Every structure is written in C-alpha cells, then in structure tokens.
Design a binder for this molecule. Structure first.
Ligand SMILES: Nc1ncnc2c1ncn2[C@@H]1O[C@H](COP(=O)(O)OP(=O)(O)OP(=O)(O)O)[C@@H](O)[C@H]1O
Ligand SMILES: Nc1ncnc2c1ncn2[C@@H]1O[C@H](COP(=O)(O)OP(=O)(O)OP(=O)(O)O)[C@@H](O)[C@H]1O
Ligand SMILES: [N-]=[N+]=Nc1cccc(COC(=O)NCCCC[C@H](N)C(=O)O)c1
Ligand SMILES: [N-]=[N+]=Nc1cccc(COC(=O)NCCCC[C@H](N)C(=O)O)c1
Ligand SMILES: [K+]
Ligand SMILES: [K+]
Ligand SMILES: [Mg+2]
Ligand SMILES: [Mg+2]
Ligand SMILES: [Mg+2]
Ligand SMILES: [Mg+2]
Ligand SMILES: [Mg+2]
Ligand SMILES: [Mg+2]
Lengths: 264, 264
C-alpha cells in the first residue's frame, strides 16, 4: 500500500538525520510511525536526563566565550528599533522584508546599525582597536524555504581602527569556523547595503556575509575609521552541524526541541 | 553658581552608585562633568581589558546553569507570537500594553503561553515531573518610570505533575534568590490572568509573580495536571544587585554598557 502526502509529511517530521529508514519500503504507515515515535521519545528522554541545554542557547554561549576570550566586548542591544534606521542603512523603499511595529518602529533585520552606533560611541573611550560582537534575534519576512526563517538568530562581530584588513577578517572567520568544526570557502558577492561582500559558503549554503570597510554608508553613521565585520546565522550553523534537512529544526519553535519533534 | 536641569541630568547620567559626589556643592559643572567622565572612561576601559561580558548576557548564563543543574529543560521559544494568544490568556480587551506586529501577530508580553504549550507537549514524552524554563525578551507598552522597560528580559521556570505545591515553589524561589544573594519576602497579590499570586518583593520592588495551579485558564491551554511557575525580570534583578537608581541602566540599550553611560 502507498503512503499519502499527509502520511509522508508526518514521518518526515519524526525522522532524524541519523536514521536510515525507507519510508516507501511497503511497511505500513502505522509501523513506521510507531518506530519513529519510539526513537524520538527515547531521544527526548535522554536529553532531559543528561544534557538539558537548548541547541541555540548552547551555541550562543559557546560563540560568546570564543569572542570574549579573543578581546571582543559582548553587546546586547535593542531588538525593537527605530524604523528610521532602515532608510538610513540604504535599504531603499529587502525593504518589503521588514516587520513594522506601531508606526515608527520595526523589528531589527540585522545587528549592524546598533553595532555601528556602539563602535562610534566606544571609540571615544576605549583604546584602539575597538572589538565588539552581538548575538541575538533578527527578523525578516521571507518566502518559505529550507534555509530561511522569519525569526532567526544573528552573530555579528566587528572591529574598528587598526587591524581592519581583509586578511585579518579572513583569519578571524577561519579561527571561528575551525573552532566549530565547519568547513567553508570564501566567494565574492554583493549586496544593496554594504556593496561587495566576502560570503562564507558551506557548499551552496551561505553562512555569512562579511565586509571590509570603509564604505560610503559610514558617513551617515559617524564611522570615520577602517573597520571589518561579519554576520552569521546561528540556525544555519546548527543546520550544518546536525545535518538537518530544513532549517526549521534549528529555530525557536514550539514544534521541535533540539531537532526532535515535540508532536509525540 | 547653580546647576540647570539639563546640567543635573547630564551629571546623573555619568554618576554611578559607588560614587559619593555632591552635585550641588558649588563646584562648577565643568569640573563635576570632567571628574565623572574620567571615572566612567576608567570603568569602561577596565571592563574592556578584564571582563568583557554583558551584565544581561552573563546573568542569563548564570541563571541557565542554575536551572539546568536542577533538572529543568532550557527552552528558547518564539518572541513574535500569534495575537490570538492574548485573548486566550484572559487578557480582556494590559491589553493596551501589547505591541502589535502586522495584523495577526504581536511581541510576547510574557513567556507563559509558550511554556504552557511546551508543558502540554512534553508531558506526552517525558517522565513526571516536567520541569522547564525560559529566559528571553518580552515587550509591554509602559508609562515611563524607574522600574519598567518596554523591552525587558523575563525568566520563567515552571513544573507540572508531582511536586507542584506552594512549599516546593517557595523553596525553589528561595534557593534561586539565595544563589544570587538577593534578600526578599513573599506577599500575596492578584492579577487578571492568573488570579492569586505569590509576589516576591525586595522592599517595594516586585521581583516576581509566582502561581500555584491549577487555575481555570488551564483548560483553554490543555493543561490538566498540577503545576507551579514563576516569572522574574532580569533587569530588576540587576537593579537590585548593582543598586541602580533607574532600571534603564540595566536594559538593552545603546545608552549604557553594564550601567556605564556610553555618551563619553
Ligand atoms: N531569513 C533568514 N533565516 C536564517 N538565517 C538568515 C536569514 N537571513 C540571513 N540569515 C543569516 O544571516 C547572515 C547575514 O545576513 P545577510 O543579510 O548576509 O543574509 P542574506 O545575504 O540575505 O542571506 P540569503 O541570501 O541566504 O537570503 C546570512 O549569511 C545568514 O547566515
Ligand atoms: N515593563 C517591565 N519592565 C521590567 N520588568 C518587568 C516589566 N513587567 C514585568 N516585569 C518583570 O516580570 C515579572 C513578571 O511579570 P508580571 O506580569 O508579574 O509583572 P507585573 O505584575 O505587571 O509587574 P508590575 O506590577 O511591576 O508592573 C515582574 O515581577 C517583573 O520582575
Ligand atoms: N551601516 N553602517 N555602517 C557600519 C559601519 C561600520 C561598522 C558597522 C558594523 O556592522 C557590521 O558589521 N557590518 C558588517 C555586517 C555584514 C552582515 C550584514 N547582516 C549584511 O546584510 O551583509 C556598520
Ligand atoms: N496560560 N496558562 N496556563 C498555564 C498553565 C500551566 C503552566 C503555565 C506556565 O507558565 C507559567 O508559569 N505561569 C506562571 C507565570 C507567572 C508570571 C506571569 N508573567 C504573570 O503575568 O503573573 C501556564
Ligand atoms: K534520515
Ligand atoms: K552615587
Ligand atoms: Mg536574504
Ligand atoms: Mg545572500
Ligand atoms: Mg549575505
Ligand atoms: Mg505591569
Ligand atoms: Mg504587579
Ligand atoms: Mg506581577
């Protein structure tokens, strides 16, 4: 007997990368579902007995330790930001991807503008070079797909002053991804806000866009020194690490816990 | 010569609890400002040289370790939630405090509804009792004041099944606040959503509202067992720990870093 689309979808929710099970072997849906339900209950029970840490939270903590230990200041800045930042970032009326709140605010679609303000302010007090980073939620309206979430988690690290060269940026990216065990290559790309980017690719998956300043946008943000920076999506990092087929397994969700369905 | 309101406000931005300086001693504004600017630059330089951790991030990490080590599962759930959750929580049309996003979403004003969904789902897979917690951003429109932020950080821990008594709830609260070194008392209060609460007070400052279920709301969320839970604001905890006069010193902000003005 054949499986319906609804039945296949249910089994795909319960399947995990480490399994090797044929969904269309001819084994009935009831036995495939029962087997996968038992494997997933066992997996969740083991997490609850022995680890208890959320993958996104744990990865944020691991990344925070890496950057703090390398001299970067840990920032936590507003998620709800002025809508005026959008136009001022050169997102001309991507603009359609912004979640608006009330009439003068929005959910930040990236960390960059708040970090640019911190670089400018901290350069009045701290010695050269200024090194900061932030990890937290960002928001974009997206077409459904395997590598995009509307609510995702960004890391952005950046530096301003001395040492803001392409080679130092590539070296930090290399140390960072070597620390996480993730293979990558760097390919050129370009974007509306920053211009030319160094995109960090794991196969066809974009893990990061990175930028070597200065750029013309700097003047509108009061940035007047060389700078480098890069933005990474944490759920994309987890998708690679855990071989997830869909990024939703990695997301803030009520539907998956550490990639295990919560519909059991 | 006397200080203007603008001058006093500037000195108050630069003043920290550990200082003992008379603003209206007759010393001129220029010398008070220069002295406080030097103290704050020194403070920020010491943070950058020797700690580099953000107070909110560090406190989240400390609280996470406490609860994980006591058997609670770490949750990270959506911040952008369905607007339908508001009515379903008994926030009758507090309702005016909700930030709406688009037409069917809002920013969560509390963690409770997402945690109720997790308790219900996890009770199908995990052994009794179910113990979970979450730390993250919550949002409410507020009248300006010394103890409220529009963007704040909540901890909520909760348990469902056995052990869901007032005495066990009070014992967890006591262990938690003893771990942070914060004195408190418990006073009864009541709220629209949950009914009677045990409010955890540090002087006149409400650190938490806690609840012993069951309550009538349970049926609308599929909760059908005893439960306990409590919600704490992290910025209020930091206000107590650091003796800040205004909670804004503790907030996600571009204006203060670990309670030090970034306008230097
Ligand atoms: N909607 C999203 N969901 C998950 N991660 C995202 C999303 N948008 C961006 N990111 C992550 O943030 C990083 C920095 O953002 P950037 O603006 O460069 O993304 P992007 O170039 O729009 O990505 P893409 O081309 O895949 O849409 C990306 O390299 C990616 O890892
Ligand atoms: N606007 C806010 N800013 C900062 N912390 C808050 C805010 N609202 C609530 N909290 C924190 O979250 C906890 C749980 O939320 P709860 O709904 O009980 O607050 P509340 O009773 O409305 O607080 P209050 O009476 O002070 O407005 C509070 O005890 C407090 O520590
Ligand atoms: N705007 N502006 N001017 C500045 C000036 C100086 C530094 C910063 C710091 O922030 C950054 O690091 N920018 C690089 C981020 C690259 C990732 C990004 N999400 C992207 O959409 O490609 C901003
Ligand atoms: N809704 N509903 N039903 C349930 C049923 C079971 C458990 C939960 C779990 O969530 C909770 O812990 N509730 C207690 C939170 C108290 C703090 C809160 N911010 C307040 O406004 O007073 C919710
Ligand atoms: K598989
Ligand atoms: K003082
Ligand atoms: Mg994109
Ligand atoms: Mg791209
Ligand atoms: Mg990109
Ligand atoms: Mg209130
Ligand atoms: Mg109250
Ligand atoms: Mg309360």
């Amino acid at each position: 007997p054949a499986l319906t689309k609804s039945q296949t979808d249910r089994l795909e929710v319960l399947l995990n990368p480490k399994d090797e099970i044929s969904l269309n072997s001819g084994k009935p849906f009831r036995e495939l579902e029962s087997e996968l339900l038992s494997r997933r209950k066992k997996d969740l029970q083991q997490i609850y007995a022995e680890e208890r840490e959320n993958y996104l939270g744990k990865l944020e903590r691991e990344i925070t330790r890496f950057f703090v230990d390398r001299g970067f200041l840990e920032i936590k800045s507003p998620i709800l930001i002025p809508l005026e930042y959008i136009e001022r970032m050169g997102i001309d009326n991507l603009s359609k991807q912004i979640f608006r709140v009330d009439k003068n605010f929005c959910l930040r679609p990236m960390l960059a503008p708040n970090l640019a303000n911190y670089l400018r302010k901290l350069d009045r007090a701290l010695p050269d070079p200024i090194k900061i980073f932030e990890i937290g939620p960002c928001y974009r309206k997206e077409s459904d797909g395997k590598e995009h979430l509307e609510e995702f988690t960004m890391l952005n690290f950046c530096q301003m002053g001395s040492g803001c060269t392409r080679e130092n940026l590539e070296s930090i990216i290399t140390d960072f991804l070597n620390h996480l065990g993730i293979d990558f290559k760097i390919v050129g790309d370009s974007c509306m806000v920053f211009g030319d980017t160094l995109d960090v690719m794991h196969g066809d998956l974009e893990l990061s866009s990175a930028v070597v300043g200065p750029i013309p946008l700097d003047r509108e943000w009061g940035i007047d020194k060389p700078w480098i920076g890069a933005g990474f999506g944490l759920e994309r990092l987890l998708k690679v690490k855990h071989d997830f087929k869909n990024i939703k397994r990695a997301a803030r969700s009520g539907s998956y816990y550490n990639g295990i369905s919560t519909n059991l």
